[PDB]
PDB file of C-alpha atoms in Angstrom:
ATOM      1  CA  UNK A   1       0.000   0.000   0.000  1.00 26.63           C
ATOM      2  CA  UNK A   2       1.243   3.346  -0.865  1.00 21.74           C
ATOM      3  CA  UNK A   3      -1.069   6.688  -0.140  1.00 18.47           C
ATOM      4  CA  UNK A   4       0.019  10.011   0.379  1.00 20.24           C
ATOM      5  CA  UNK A   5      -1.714  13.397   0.678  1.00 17.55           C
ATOM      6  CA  UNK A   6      -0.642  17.036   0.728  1.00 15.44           C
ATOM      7  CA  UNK A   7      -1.799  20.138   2.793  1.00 17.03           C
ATOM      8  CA  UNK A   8      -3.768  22.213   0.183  1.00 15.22           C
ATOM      9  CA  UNK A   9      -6.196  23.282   3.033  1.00 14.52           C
ATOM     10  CA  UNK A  10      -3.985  26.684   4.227  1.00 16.79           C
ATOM     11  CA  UNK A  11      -4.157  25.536   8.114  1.00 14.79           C
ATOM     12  CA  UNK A  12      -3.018  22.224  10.293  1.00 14.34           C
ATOM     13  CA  UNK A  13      -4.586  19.024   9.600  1.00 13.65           C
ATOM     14  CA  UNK A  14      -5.092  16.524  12.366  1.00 15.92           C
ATOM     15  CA  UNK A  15      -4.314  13.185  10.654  1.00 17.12           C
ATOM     16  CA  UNK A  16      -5.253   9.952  12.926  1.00 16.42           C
ATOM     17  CA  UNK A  17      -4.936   6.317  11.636  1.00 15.14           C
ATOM     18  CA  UNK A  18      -4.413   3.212  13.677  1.00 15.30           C
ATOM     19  CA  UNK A  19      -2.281   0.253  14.238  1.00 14.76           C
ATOM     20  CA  UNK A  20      -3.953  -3.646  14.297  1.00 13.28           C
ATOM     21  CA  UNK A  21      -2.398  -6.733  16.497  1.00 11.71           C
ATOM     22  CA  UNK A  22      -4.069  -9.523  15.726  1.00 11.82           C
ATOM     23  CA  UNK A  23      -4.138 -12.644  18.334  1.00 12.54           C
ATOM     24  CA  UNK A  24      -3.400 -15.651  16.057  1.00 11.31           C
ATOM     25  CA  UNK A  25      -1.014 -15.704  12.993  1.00 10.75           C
ATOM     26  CA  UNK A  26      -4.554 -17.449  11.713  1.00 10.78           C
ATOM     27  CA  UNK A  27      -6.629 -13.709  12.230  1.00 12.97           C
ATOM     28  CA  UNK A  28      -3.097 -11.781  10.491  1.00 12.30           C
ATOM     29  CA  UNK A  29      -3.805 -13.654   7.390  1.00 12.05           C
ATOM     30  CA  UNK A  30      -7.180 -14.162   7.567  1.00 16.46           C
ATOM     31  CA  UNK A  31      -6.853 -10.201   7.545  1.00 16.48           C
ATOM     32  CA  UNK A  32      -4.041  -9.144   5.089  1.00 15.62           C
ATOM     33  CA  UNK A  33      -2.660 -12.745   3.790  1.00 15.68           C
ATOM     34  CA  UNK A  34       0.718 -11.424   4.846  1.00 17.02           C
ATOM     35  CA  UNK A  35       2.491 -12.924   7.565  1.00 21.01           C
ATOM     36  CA  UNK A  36       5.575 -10.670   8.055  1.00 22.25           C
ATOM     37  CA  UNK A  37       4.117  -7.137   7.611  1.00 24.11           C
ATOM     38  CA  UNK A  38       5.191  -3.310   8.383  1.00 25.41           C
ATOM     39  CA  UNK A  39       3.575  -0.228   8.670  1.00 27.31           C
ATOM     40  CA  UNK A  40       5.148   2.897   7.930  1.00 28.73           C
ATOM     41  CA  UNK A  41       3.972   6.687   8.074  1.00 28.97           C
ATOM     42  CA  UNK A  42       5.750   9.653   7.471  1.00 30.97           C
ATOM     43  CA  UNK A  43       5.875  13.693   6.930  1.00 27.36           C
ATOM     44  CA  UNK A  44       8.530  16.367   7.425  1.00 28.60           C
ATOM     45  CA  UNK A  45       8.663  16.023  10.672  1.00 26.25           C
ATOM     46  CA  UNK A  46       6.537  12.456  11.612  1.00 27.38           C
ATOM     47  CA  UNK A  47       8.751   9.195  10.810  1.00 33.45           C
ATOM     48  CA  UNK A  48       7.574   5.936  12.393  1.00 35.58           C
ATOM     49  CA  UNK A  49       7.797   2.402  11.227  1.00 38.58           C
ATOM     50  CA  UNK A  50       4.868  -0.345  12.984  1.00 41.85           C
ATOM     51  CA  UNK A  51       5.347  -3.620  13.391  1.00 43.49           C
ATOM     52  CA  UNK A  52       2.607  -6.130  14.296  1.00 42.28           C
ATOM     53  CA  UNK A  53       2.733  -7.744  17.329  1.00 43.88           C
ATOM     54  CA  UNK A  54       0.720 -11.254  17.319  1.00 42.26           C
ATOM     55  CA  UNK A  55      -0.580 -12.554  20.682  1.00 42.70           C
ATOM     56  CA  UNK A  56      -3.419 -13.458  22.727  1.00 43.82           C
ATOM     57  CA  UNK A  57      -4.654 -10.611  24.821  1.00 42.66           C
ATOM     58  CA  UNK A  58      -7.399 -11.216  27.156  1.00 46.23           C
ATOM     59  CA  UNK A  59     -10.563 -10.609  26.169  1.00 44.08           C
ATOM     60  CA  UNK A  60     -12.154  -7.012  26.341  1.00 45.16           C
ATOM     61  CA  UNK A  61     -14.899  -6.311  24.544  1.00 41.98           C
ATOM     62  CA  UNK A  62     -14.487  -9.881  22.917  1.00 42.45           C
ATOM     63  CA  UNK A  63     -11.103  -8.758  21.218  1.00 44.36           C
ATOM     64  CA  UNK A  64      -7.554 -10.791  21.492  1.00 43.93           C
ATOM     65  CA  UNK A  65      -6.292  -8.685  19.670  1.00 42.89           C
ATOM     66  CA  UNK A  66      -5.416  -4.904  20.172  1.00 41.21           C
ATOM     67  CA  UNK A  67      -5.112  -1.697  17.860  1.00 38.85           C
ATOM     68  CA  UNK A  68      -3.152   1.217  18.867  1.00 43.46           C
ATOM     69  CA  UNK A  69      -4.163   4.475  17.952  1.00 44.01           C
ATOM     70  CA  UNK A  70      -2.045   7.515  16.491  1.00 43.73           C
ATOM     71  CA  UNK A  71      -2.323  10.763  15.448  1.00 44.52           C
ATOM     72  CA  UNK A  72       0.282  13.438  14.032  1.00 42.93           C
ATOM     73  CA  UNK A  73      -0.597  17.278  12.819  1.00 44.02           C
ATOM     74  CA  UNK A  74       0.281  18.024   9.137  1.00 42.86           C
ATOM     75  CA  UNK A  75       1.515  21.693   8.492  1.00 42.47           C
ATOM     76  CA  UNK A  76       0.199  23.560   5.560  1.00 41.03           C
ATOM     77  CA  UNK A  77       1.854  22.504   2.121  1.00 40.88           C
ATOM     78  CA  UNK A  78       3.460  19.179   3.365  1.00 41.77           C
ATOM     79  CA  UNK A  79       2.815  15.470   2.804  1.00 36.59           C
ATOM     80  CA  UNK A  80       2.110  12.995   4.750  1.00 35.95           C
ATOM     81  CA  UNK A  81       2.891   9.025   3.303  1.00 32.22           C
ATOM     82  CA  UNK A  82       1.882   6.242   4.213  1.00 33.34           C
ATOM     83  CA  UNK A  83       3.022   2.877   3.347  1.00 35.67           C
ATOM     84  CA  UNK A  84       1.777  -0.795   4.448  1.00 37.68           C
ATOM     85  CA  UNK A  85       1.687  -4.621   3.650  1.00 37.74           C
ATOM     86  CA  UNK A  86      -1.308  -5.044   6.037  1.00 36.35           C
ATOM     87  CA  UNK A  87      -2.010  -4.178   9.499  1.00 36.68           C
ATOM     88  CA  UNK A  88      -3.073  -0.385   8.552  1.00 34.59           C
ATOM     89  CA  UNK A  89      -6.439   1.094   9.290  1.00 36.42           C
ATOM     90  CA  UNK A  90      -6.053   3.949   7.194  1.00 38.62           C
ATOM     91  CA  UNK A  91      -7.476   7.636   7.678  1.00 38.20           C
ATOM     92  CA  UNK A  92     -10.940   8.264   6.058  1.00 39.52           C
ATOM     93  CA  UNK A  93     -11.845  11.890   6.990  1.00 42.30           C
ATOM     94  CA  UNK A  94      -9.221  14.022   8.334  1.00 42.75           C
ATOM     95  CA  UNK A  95      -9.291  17.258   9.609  1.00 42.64           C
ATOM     96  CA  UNK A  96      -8.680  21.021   9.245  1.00 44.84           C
ATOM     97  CA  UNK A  97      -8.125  22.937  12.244  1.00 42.90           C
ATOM     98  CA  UNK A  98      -6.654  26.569  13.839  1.00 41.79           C
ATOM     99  CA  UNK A  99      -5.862  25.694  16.821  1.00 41.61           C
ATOM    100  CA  UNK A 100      -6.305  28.971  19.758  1.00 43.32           C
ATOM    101  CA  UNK A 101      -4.471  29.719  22.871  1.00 40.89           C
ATOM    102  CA  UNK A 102      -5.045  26.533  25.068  1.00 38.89           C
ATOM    103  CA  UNK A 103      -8.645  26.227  27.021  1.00 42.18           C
ATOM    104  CA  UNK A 104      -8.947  23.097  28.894  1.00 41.01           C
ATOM    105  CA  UNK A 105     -11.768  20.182  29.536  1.00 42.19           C
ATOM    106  CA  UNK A 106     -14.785  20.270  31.942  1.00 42.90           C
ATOM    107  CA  UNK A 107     -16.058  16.555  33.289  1.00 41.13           C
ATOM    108  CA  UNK A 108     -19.079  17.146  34.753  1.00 42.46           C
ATOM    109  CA  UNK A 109     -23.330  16.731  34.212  1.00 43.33           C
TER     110      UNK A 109
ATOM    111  CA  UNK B   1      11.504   3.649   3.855  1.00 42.99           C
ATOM    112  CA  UNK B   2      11.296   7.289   1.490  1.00 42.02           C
ATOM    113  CA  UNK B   3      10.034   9.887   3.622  1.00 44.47           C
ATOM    114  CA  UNK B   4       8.963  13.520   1.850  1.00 43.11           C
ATOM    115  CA  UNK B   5      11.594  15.075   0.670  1.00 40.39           C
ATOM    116  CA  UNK B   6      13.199  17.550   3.476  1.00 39.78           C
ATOM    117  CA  UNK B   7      16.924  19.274   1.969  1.00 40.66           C
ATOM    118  CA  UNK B   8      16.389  17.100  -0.539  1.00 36.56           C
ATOM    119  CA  UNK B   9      17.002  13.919   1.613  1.00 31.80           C
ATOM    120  CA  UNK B  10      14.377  11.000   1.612  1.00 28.17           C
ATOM    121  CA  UNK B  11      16.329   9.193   4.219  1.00 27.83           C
ATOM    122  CA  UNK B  12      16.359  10.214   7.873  1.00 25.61           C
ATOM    123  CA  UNK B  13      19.228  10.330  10.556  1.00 28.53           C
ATOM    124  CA  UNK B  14      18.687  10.197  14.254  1.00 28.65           C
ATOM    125  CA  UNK B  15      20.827  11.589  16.478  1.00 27.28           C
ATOM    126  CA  UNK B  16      21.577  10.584  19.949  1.00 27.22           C
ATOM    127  CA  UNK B  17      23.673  11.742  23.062  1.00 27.25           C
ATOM    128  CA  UNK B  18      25.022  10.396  26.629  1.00 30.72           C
ATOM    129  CA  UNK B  19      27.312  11.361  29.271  1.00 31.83           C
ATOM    130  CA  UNK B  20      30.107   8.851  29.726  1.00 27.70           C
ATOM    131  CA  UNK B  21      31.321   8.739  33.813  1.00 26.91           C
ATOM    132  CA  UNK B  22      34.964   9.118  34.670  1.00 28.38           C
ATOM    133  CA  UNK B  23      36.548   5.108  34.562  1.00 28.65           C
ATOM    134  CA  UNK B  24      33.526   4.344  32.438  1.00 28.39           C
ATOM    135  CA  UNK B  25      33.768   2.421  28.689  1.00 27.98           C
ATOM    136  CA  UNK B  26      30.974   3.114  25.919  1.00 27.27           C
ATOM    137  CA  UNK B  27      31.085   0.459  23.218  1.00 23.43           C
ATOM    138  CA  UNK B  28      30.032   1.241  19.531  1.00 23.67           C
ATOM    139  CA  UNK B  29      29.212  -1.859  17.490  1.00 28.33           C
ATOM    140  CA  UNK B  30      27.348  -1.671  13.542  1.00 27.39           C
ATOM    141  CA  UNK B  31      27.237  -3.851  10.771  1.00 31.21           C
ATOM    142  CA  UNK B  32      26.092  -0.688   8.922  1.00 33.50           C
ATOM    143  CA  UNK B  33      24.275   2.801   9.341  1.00 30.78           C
ATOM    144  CA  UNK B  34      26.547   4.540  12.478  1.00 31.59           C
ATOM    145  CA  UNK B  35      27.342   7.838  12.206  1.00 32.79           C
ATOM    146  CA  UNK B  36      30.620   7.577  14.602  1.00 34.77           C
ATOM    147  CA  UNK B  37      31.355  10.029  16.521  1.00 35.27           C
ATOM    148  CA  UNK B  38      34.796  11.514  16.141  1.00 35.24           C
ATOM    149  CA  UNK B  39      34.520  14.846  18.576  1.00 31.18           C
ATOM    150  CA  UNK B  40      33.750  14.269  21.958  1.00 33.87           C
ATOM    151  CA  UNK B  41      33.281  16.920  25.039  1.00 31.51           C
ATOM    152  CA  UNK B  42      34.655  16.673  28.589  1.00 34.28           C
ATOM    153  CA  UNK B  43      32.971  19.031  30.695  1.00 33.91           C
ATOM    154  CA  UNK B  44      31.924  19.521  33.958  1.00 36.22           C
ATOM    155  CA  UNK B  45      28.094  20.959  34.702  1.00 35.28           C
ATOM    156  CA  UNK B  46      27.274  23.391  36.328  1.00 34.53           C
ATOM    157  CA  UNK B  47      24.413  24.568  38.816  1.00 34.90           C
ATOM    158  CA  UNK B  48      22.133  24.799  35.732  1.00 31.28           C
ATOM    159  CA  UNK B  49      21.652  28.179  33.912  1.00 31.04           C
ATOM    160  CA  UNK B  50      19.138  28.743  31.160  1.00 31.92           C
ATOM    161  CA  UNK B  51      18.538  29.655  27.126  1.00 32.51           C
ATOM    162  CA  UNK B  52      18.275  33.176  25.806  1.00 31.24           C
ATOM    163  CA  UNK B  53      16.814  33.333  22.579  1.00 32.61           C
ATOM    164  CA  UNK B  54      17.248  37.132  21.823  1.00 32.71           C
ATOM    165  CA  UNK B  55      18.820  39.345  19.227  1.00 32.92           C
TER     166      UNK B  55
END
């Protein structure tokens, strides 16, 4: 897999995508039919290479597996790559953002 | 893996530092891709002072 998309959108975009670990070498190529996979993502600044770790977790929510979730901000006019033999769930909507001086986050009813 | 271009390099290099104690040994070992050092700095610290970015 090879997808990459530029900044035309004049502020930050706010790029997540995650990471799958499947629990059986069965469910990895059941999945992406590839049994030694990567994942790798990278800007200007972002650079990060995945690697699939195969296990049995216990249960939570019926999942042995696990999927890590990331995130990186992608300046105006740069690109952002990414690259995969399996193991990626990609972005689908991504988003532009300004961000202000920081406010913060109320818990309550 | 190519990265977007940045000085027209689709590589990356990482760079990384430690202090090595008086009497102490630090071992470099590579079957490729080490950027050796060939400069190193004795010093001594200081009670810590700060940055001044200012023209």
């Amino acid at each position: 897999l090879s997808k990459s998309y530029i900044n035309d959108k004049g502020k930050e975009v706010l790029v997540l995508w995650g990471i799958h670990h499947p629990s059986t070498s069965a469910d990895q190529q059941s999945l992406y039919q590839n049994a030694d996979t990567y994942v790798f993502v990278g800007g200007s600044r972002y650079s990060k290479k995945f690697k699939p770790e195969i296990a049995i977790r216990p249960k939570v929510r019926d999942q042995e597996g696990r999927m890590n979730y990331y995130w990186t901000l992608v300046e105006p006019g740069d690109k952002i790559t990414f690259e995969a033999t399996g193991n990626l769930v990609v972005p689908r909507y991504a988003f532009a953002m300004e961000r202000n001086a920081g406010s913060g986050i109320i818990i309550s009813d």
